[PDB]
Amino acid sequence: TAPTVVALYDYTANRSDELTIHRGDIIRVFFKDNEDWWYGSIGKGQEGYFPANHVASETLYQELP
């Protein structure tokens, strides 16, 4: 429920409690709120919601072409 994942697709924050993520960014998941929205960190003091459908496992990311 609290993996380290990688952004596959860019997302721009659209609320004050969201992250902006870019493809390749490493995200430390803190919570899986529901199937659509997860919450986690991109760095010291940088936390927020992000869409689950924009991320992938480290394994998948490293196996892309």
DSSP notation for 1-39: ---EEEESS-B---STTB--B-TT-EEEEEEE-SSSEEE
- What are the Cα distances from residue 56, in Å, to 45, 52, 59? 22, 8, 8
The resolution in angstroms reads 1.5
Give residues with Cβ within 8 angstroms of 31, minimum separation 6: 1, 2, 38, 39, 40
3-state secondary structure of 61: helix
Annotated domain spans of the chain: 1-65
Q: How was this structure determined?
A: X-ray
Residue 27 burial (C-beta neighbours within 10 Å; 0-12, 13-18, 19+): buried
At 11, give phi and psi (nearest 5°). -145, 130
d(CA 5, CA 60): 10
What secondary structure letter does DSSP report for 53? G
Architecture of domain 1-65: Roll (2.30)
d(CA 32, CA 52): 8
